[PDB]
Design a protein around this ligand. Structure first.
Ligand code: 8CZ
Length: 150
């Protein structure tokens, strides 16, 4: 019973979380997941400031109100070569990665590793935070509050 959470650097408190190496998070699960990191879904303004500090990914993820990809450099296979916060307009499907916002993070680029999941609750799942540099933090718990996400 295991969940891998791949996380990034934080940029003005914003970071990306990919679950089990595939698009697999619902909007309800995304809010609960960010809550386990003492974080919330970023607002579009928070995401734009993170972008301006150096944040970009090549994955769709939830923010408040939309599913987006922050882009700095044009890349043909990432958001159809767009720059800025690219907003997903048309999709049949509901599951993506998520972005999260931690207000107590440093103001600009923070590429230190994440070493805790401070606000998960009691549960049976082995949750493993996986950093980009491979370092890991694991703990037994749960973060999903909606049964349909389990
Ligand atoms: C534990 C941790 N490791 C690096 S920063 C940091 C922290 O204070 N957080 C609140 C983390 C859990 C959020 C991912 C930003």
């Amino acid at each position: 019973n295991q969940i891998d959470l791949n996380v990034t650097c934080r940029y003005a408190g914003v970071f990306h979380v990919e679950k089990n190496g595939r698009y697999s998070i619902s909007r309800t699960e995304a809010a609960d997941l960010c809550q386990a990191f003492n974080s919330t879904l970023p607002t579009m303004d928070q995401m734009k400031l993170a972008l301006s500090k150096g944040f970009e990914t090549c994955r769709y993820g939830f923010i408040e109100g939309n599913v987006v990809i922050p882009r700095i450099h044009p890349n043909a296979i990432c958001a159809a070569n767009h720059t800025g916060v690219y907003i997903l307009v048309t999709s049949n499907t509901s599951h993506y990665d998520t972005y999260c916002f931690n207000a107590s993070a440093p103001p600009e680029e923070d590429c230190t590793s994440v070493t805790d999941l401070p606000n998960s609750f009691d549960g049976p799942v082995t949750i493993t935070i996986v950093n980009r540099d491979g370092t890991r933090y694991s703990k037994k718990g749960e973060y999903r509050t909606h049964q349909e996400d389990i």
